Structure 1
Amino acid sequence: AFAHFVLIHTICHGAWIWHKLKPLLEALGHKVTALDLAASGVDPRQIEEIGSFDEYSEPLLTFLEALPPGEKVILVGESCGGLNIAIAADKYCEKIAAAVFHNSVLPDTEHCPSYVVDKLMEVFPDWKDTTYFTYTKDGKEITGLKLGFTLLRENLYTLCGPEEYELAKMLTRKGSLFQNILAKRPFFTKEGYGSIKKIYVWTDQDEIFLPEFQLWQIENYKPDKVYKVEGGDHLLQLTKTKEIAEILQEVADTYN
């Protein structure tokens, strides 16, 4: 079967991270939308204009709003994209056939929104040459960051080619986890986010979202289906593009 996939990048990243997977999915006959979230990729906004993970998700929310009644899509989020998925699901669960997590955070409904993010910081505390800054928006102090080039090279693009890593150095922008804002945000709902089908894709060779963290998330919030890709790195859409497309095809044939 064919499906309409909506690819969601992580903070500091942009739609460009999906430049290899998107054409492959289309070669399978699927419809693919790869969005730039607020202040990401070529979006015109700067991070200082964004005050929460929800505002950061605007482009995704607006896209879903534009979907005619009856049209469903399969969301695919990488790394922190899982949070965008949760936010979107509490607003448009009926338009989501399923959500696919790609080495991504997996929020739940029993703990506050920042729960898995706080856990991630515990498992991976050293972000190496990543730099941080602060700005104020809507009366709150937000911590912004810019992923370090060494961190990118060693933990994210571990096995990616130098041509792919180059795009990261040229295109990655300042972003934020809005961690303190997530902590005070209303919990994700059981009726919205809790009701959607969730497929968890990962590899134990991920050098940033370590096995301890990912296995911890799976035990914390049981996915409907779990796919483990052998080898590759954190950026499976670059190092295991073909494998990811095959998994997404199966998801398309399973959930609608």
Structure 2
Amino acid sequence: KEGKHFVLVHGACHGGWSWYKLKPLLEAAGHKVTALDLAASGTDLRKIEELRTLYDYTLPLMELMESLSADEKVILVGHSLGGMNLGLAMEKYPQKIYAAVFLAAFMPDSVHNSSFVLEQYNERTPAENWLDTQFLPYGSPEEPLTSMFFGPKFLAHKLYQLCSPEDLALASSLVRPSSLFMEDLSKAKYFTDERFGSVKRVYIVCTEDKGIPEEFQRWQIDNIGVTEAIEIKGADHMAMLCEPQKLCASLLEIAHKYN
């Protein structure tokens, strides 16, 4: 037949709703779209305190990748922390993916430590940017589990600066607690060059991003590695909300290219 299937994976503190302005566009071109809801996200009834590892969190995406047909490929699109999630999926079903796209996200590799990207980012970014963000523990002195919950100020100054007030009000009303999973990712080599490294990587840089500045974005493109690099000028962190059309046109071009 004709068309393509896109798998959208939101980032921390978000959900599938996040792709509500992009989904109609991709579909308007005749493609399949899945704005999945990772664990403890959107409407998923699982509590964040139930996720002990990055895997528990990526369970839904994983189960989806497992339900793909023999000749049913897909285009992965990870946003923010969604880049990490893609990793797990890429390692497990490399050939079931046409190409992985990292829209202003944390794109790992199969050379450095799994939490390398999230470590460098932290070190560069001062603990002041987080503003009113809540980091609450929910584990044990021996099995520490930290939670992350974006505050309203950090949402209106670092992620939604160039977004509409309607969009900020929506997010404020849906954002839930999540995590970055350090103790886990820092103690494991989840990705291998034979699997994770077999999937072509595409990165979409957001110039006006304040959560993950274009600086750290470009950095990953120069140190981690990419197959192609596309940028969206004028967009902040939530480029799917402030620049849907431009994003959709980018996602279509990627599709036409990589098979």
| Structure-2 separation of matches of 1:226 and 1:216 | 12
| Structure-1 separation of matches of 2:164 and 2:189 | 41
| Structure-2 separation of matches of 1:86 and 1:45 | 22
Question: Cα distance, 1:235 vs. partner?
Answer: 0.8
- The residue that corresponds to 2:30 in the other structure is 29
| Structure-1 separation of matches of 2:195 and 2:143 | 27
- The residue that corresponds to 1:80 in the other structure is 81
- The residue that corresponds to 2:134 in the other structure is 131
SS in 2 for 1:168: helix
What CA deviation, in whole Å up to 9, does each residue of 1:184-223 have, x standing for no partner? 0224111111110111101221111112211110111221
- For residues 175-194 of structure 1, the aligned pairs below 5 Å read 175-194=178-197
Contact 2:205 2:214 in 1 (8 A): no
- TM-score normalised by L of structure 2: 0.96
Question: Cα distance, 1:124 vs. partner?
Answer: 2.0
| Structure-1 separation of matches of 2:183 and 2:219 | 22
Please provide the CA RMSD for this pair: 1.2
Question: Cα distance, 1:33 vs. partner?
Answer: 0.6
Question: Cα distance, 1:108 vs. partner?
Answer: 1.1
- The residue that corresponds to 2:202 in the other structure is 199
SS in 2 for 1:7: strand
Counterpart check, 1:152 vs 2:155: yes
**Comparing 121-130 with 217-226, which one deviates more in the overlay?**
121-130
Question: Cα distance, 1:109 vs. partner?
Answer: 1.2
Q: Which runs of 4+ in 1 moved over 3 A?
A: none
**Comparing 185-194 with 106-115, which one deviates more in the overlay?**
185-194
Q: Mark the runs of 5 or more structure 2 residues left unpaired by the alignment.
A: none
Q: Mark the runs of 5 or more structure 1 residues left unpaired by the alignment.
A: none
Contact 2:146 2:181 in 1 (8 A): yes
Contact 1:2 1:252 in 2 (8 A): no
Identity %: 45
- The residue that corresponds to 1:16 in the other structure is 17
SS in 1 for 2:144: strand
Which is strand-richer, 1 or 2? Answer: 1
SS in 2 for 1:173: coil
Contact 1:123 1:210 in 2 (8 A): no
